[PDB]
């Protein structure tokens, strides 16, 4: 558990439907939600592969479970009952435990993605912005739409607003 | 100028079970269990079953006179809970269950 | 008149899902029978409105 979902970001966004993780920006030109295309796409692909691995790895053969035994073969019938119940027990335990573990893995995967996104933005901004606590950064300079889409792409330009941020600090 | 980092939420009510806590509301969840059936005895591998309505396999293979109402191939046999018409003359059918196993599917 | 891959006395199962809880007696390529009632795999994240 990496302390993001329910951690330092205590809420989710319902107006954000284009992705799973992303940004909410407020500048002079406006405010809005935008998804992180790369992280969302990677997460979608990984979860799709996960579901397909859980489902399709199960191989089956043509089986005819169920046999008929007359009264003088109560031992073979009991053996068949034993075979059936053992398989049922094994498969029940395996299915329940696999789902229980895999749900954990998925939730921590999402938490990790949110935390990593936050870390990336933070290491891009350095001291040109400040961390207010709820997952937001207040810019010491003026970041317009171009600067914001630069942040949401990995192409921030710290030695372009370094002087303005130093003056406003 | 503010840039917040966050995640997606929705008004979903599907819960999942987790090894550490139960009833966790998630945004989406798939089903790995099937609980529904169409309620029909349909064909297997493109071949229809052999339906013995009031007969069992013994009566059908022996020629009970109440079995003349009833395929060159089949994938499985279907007997009804009321299929009581079998060996009309009393006696014992030797290796009956072996015969039923062999007759289960014929090309 | 159907085409199905898994048959049970009550009816046919047509799915790619690996587990089922309709009947232990099955004919064909069938999902494994489990005594579970709810096997849901979490796909999205934790909903915290």
């Amino acid at each position: 558990l990496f302390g993001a979902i329910a951690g330092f970001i205590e809420g989710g966004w319902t107006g954000m439907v284009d992705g799973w993780y992303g940004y909410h920006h407020q500048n002079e030109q406006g405010s809005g939600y935008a998804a992180d295309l790369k992280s969302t796409q990677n997460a979608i692909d990984k979860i799709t592969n996960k579901v397909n691995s859980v489902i399709e790895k199960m191989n089956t053969q043509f089986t005819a479970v169920g046999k008929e035994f007359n009264h003088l073969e109560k031992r073979i019938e009991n053996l068949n009952k034993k075979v059936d119940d053992g398989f049922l027990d094994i498969w029940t335990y395996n299915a329940e435990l696999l789902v229980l573990l895999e749900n954990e893995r998925t939730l921590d995967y999402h938490d990790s993605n949110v935390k990593n996104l936050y870390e990336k933005v933070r290491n891009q901004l350095k001291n040109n912005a400040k961390e207010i606590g709820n997952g937001c950064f207040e810019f010491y300079h003026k970041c317009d739409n171009t600067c914001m889409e630069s942040v949401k792409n990995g192409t921030y330009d710290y030695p372009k607003y370094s002087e303005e941020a130093k003056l406003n600090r | 100028d503010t840039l917040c980092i966050g995640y997606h939420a929705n008004n979903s009510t599907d819960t999942v079970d987790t090894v550490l806590e139960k009833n966790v509301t998630v945004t989406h969840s798939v089903n790995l269990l099937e609980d529904k059936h169409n309620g029909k005895l349909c064909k297997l591998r493109g071949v229809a079953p052999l339906h013995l309505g009031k007969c069992n396999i013994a009566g059908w293979i022996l020629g009970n006179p109440e079995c003349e109402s009833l395929a060159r191939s089949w994938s499985y046999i279907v007997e009804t809970s009321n299929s009581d018409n079998g060996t009309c003359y009393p006696g014992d059918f030797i290796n009956y269950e072996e015969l039923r196993e062999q007759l289960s599917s014929v090309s | 008149d159907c085409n199905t891959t898994c048959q049970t006395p009550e009816g046919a199962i047509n799915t790619s899902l690996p587990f089922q809880n309709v009947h232990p007696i099955t004919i064909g390529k069938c999902p494994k029978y489990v005594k579970s009632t709810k096997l849901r795999l979490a796909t999205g994240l934790r909903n915290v409105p």
Partner: antibody
Amino acid sequence: EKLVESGGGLVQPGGSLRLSCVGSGFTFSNYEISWVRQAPGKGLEWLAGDYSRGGTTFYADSVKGRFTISSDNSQNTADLQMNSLRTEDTARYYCVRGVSVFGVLMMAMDLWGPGVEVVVSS
Amino acid sequence: TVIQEPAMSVSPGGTVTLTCAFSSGSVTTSNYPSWFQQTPGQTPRLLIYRTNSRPSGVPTRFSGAISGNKADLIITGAQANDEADYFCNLYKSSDNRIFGGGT
């Protein structure tokens, strides 16, 4: 795979009208159902969208407070109810479906219905 | 609002680009531009979504890109079946999904 709409006709201004869209060949669970209107001569206008599995409903600023969209996945239907209809609401209405994988919309309005004409002349 | 060219024409076998822009902002991949085709009197058809993706039935000659703060739909080698109205849908917000004027 098709979407069929019904419920069009003539309604006096200030009235209410209900349109229904039924889908065949797929399940409404894994899709978002939206309503798009096309006025004569003008272009398309997106009105409302409903993701029933996620329980999310979205409305355009032009029809907010008047229109209401509901969905029933069991019966595979989507209903749009229009109130306080104005003269500028006359158009051909389409029930469109949009792809949603794992609860996330991908803005892919792949399948459209033929549409139903609505005239709000007095 | 969304600005589109009101009418453009091409010669058969040639190439053409259709441009969709914002009235006041910039068009980004985060806006998920989509391109629809509508023969008059028929239901609209999804040609392109997310600026680079085509459904399983759209001909290969249709392509999409983002150039110069605008969304572009490129038709290479147009037949006579391409005489239709082309619409651009730009996603601005959950409640705001703007269709273009048409071409």
